[PDB]
Scaffold this active site. Structure first.
Site, short mmCIF file in Angstrom:
data_model
loop_
_atom_site.label_atom_id
_atom_site.label_comp_id
_atom_site.label_asym_id
_atom_site.label_seq_id
_atom_site.Cartn_x
_atom_site.Cartn_y
_atom_site.Cartn_z
N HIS A 100 9.44 2.49 5.76
CA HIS A 100 8.33 3.21 6.42
C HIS A 100 7.86 2.47 7.66
O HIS A 100 7.01 3.00 8.37
CB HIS A 100 7.20 3.46 5.44
CG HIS A 100 6.32 2.31 5.04
ND1 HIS A 100 6.48 1.60 3.87
CD2 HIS A 100 5.25 1.76 5.67
CE1 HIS A 100 5.56 0.65 3.80
NE2 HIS A 100 4.79 0.73 4.88
N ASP A 114 12.31 2.34 -0.32
CA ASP A 114 11.60 1.89 0.89
C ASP A 114 12.06 0.52 1.34
O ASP A 114 11.48 -0.55 1.14
CB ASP A 114 10.10 1.89 0.62
CG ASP A 114 9.24 1.75 1.85
OD1 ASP A 114 9.76 1.91 2.97
OD2 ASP A 114 8.03 1.49 1.70
N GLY A 158 -0.78 -3.28 7.37
CA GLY A 158 -0.35 -4.29 8.33
C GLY A 158 0.52 -5.34 7.67
O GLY A 158 1.20 -6.10 8.36
N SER A 181 2.71 -4.27 5.37
CA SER A 181 3.87 -3.48 5.02
C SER A 181 5.16 -4.12 5.51
O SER A 181 5.17 -4.54 6.67
CB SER A 181 3.83 -2.09 5.68
OG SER A 181 3.11 -1.17 4.93
N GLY A 182 6.19 -4.11 4.67
CA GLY A 182 7.50 -4.63 5.00
C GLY A 182 7.62 -6.13 4.80
O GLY A 182 8.72 -6.67 4.91
C1 LIG Z 1 4.07 5.62 4.76
C2 LIG Z 1 3.45 5.20 3.43
C3 LIG Z 1 2.01 4.66 3.56
C4 LIG Z 1 1.92 3.18 4.04
C5 LIG Z 1 1.73 2.38 2.73
C6 LIG Z 1 1.16 3.41 1.74
O1 LIG Z 1 0.41 3.15 0.76
N1 LIG Z 1 1.28 4.66 2.31
C7 LIG Z 1 0.73 5.79 1.50
C8 LIG Z 1 1.72 6.45 0.55
C9 LIG Z 1 2.72 7.35 1.04
C10 LIG Z 1 3.60 8.03 0.17
C11 LIG Z 1 3.44 7.77 -1.20
C12 LIG Z 1 2.46 6.88 -1.70
C13 LIG Z 1 1.58 6.21 -0.83
O2 LIG Z 1 2.50 6.79 -3.09
C14 LIG Z 1 3.59 7.68 -3.46
O3 LIG Z 1 4.17 8.28 -2.25
C15 LIG Z 1 0.75 1.28 3.15
C16 LIG Z 1 0.08 0.42 2.12
C17 LIG Z 1 -1.19 0.70 1.61
C18 LIG Z 1 -1.76 -0.07 0.59
C19 LIG Z 1 -1.08 -1.19 0.09
C20 LIG Z 1 -1.63 -2.01 -0.93
N2 LIG Z 1 -2.84 -1.79 -1.45
N3 LIG Z 1 -0.95 -3.09 -1.44
C21 LIG Z 1 0.20 -1.47 0.62
C22 LIG Z 1 0.77 -0.70 1.62
N4 LIG Z 1 -0.23 1.94 4.08
C23 LIG Z 1 -0.86 1.01 5.07
C24 LIG Z 1 -0.20 1.31 6.43
C25 LIG Z 1 1.05 2.09 6.11
C26 LIG Z 1 0.63 2.91 4.87
#
Ligand SMILES: CC[C@@H]1[C@@H]2[C@H](C(=O)N1Cc1ccc3c(c1)OCO3)[C@H](c1ccc(C(=N)N)cc1)N1CCC[C@@H]21
Ligand SMILES: [Ca+2]
Length: 223
Positions: free
Chosen positions: A40, A84, A175, A177-178
């Protein structure tokens, strides 16, 4: 990172910043010409920044290298965040040193209760955006599958695991992420998703890297 601590400069030498005019994602260096990150995090125009502590100041030990290609897992699903993971090839090989080094891939999957190190430059607050200059670190255990699936019923695949604290207050966040989840010196996870940050009963979810080692190796060998 919410609830973490200042890592200290170049204490996490495999950590990378993905930059497109600003930091948007983390990554892990796994040899001198390849980085592992999250699917992502894909975009065009990626510059990889190695050897960073303060991402806003040139301090010394930085290497800025353009990505020559980014390879998203072909079965990545944007709805479910399954598979992912993404590989990035550097235009040129990094110069490896005390402060810029690779992290090993696992030979086996980690078990529940394994304590891991998670790092990144993402948000340090849950409700509100405060981004750090310097790299933050968090020690967090891998949770059992039963606890992970009870937290996120129906959303957890075999390619995912949960890590963190059900009581809240400590988590990865936007931020981050990855970025790397490293346990006993091996890369076991990639910061993928979650529900807010550091919320009670909503731990972080991570790509389970041990399920992709052969794919990683076969892909790098052919590119
Ligand atoms: C692009 C994805 C996005 C991403 C990460 C995420 O949680 N998303 C939401 C998402 C999308 C699809 C899903 C989902 C959550 O659960 C099932 O299918 C990510 C994210 C959010 C929260 C955490 C965490 N609490 N550890 C870790 C990563 N966010 C922050 C910026 C990018 C965005
Ligand atoms: Ca810097």
């Amino acid at each position: 990172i919410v609830g973490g601590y200042t890592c200290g400069a170049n204490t996490v030498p495999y950590q990378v910043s993905l930059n497109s005019g600003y930091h948007f994602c983390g990554g892990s260096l796994i040899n001198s010409q390849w980085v592992v990150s999250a699917a992502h995090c894909y975009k065009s125009g990626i510059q990889v920044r190695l050897g960073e502590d303060n991402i806003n100041v040139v301090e010394g030990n930085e290497q800025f290298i353009s990505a020559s290609k980014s390879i998203v897992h072909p079965s990545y699903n944007s709805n479910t965040l399954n598979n992912d993971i993404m590989l990035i090839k550097l235009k040129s090989a990094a110069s490896l040193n005390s402060r810029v080094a690779s992290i090993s891939l696992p030979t086996s999957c980690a078990s529940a209760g394994t304590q891991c190190l998670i790092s990144g430059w993402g948000n340090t607050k849950s409700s509100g955006t405060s981004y750090p200059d310097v790299l933050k670190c968090l020690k967090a255990p891998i949770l059992s599958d039963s606890s992970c699936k009870s937290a996120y019923p129906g959303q957890i695949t075999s390619n995912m695991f949960c890590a963190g604290y059900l009581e809240g207050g400590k988590d990865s966040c936007q931020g981050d992420s990855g970025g790397p989840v490293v346990c006993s010196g091996k890369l076991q996870g990639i910061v993928s998703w979650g529900s807010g940050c550091a919320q009670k009963n909503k731990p972080g979810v991570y790509t389970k890297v041990c399920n992709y080692v052969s794919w990683i190796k076969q892909t790098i060998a052919s590119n």
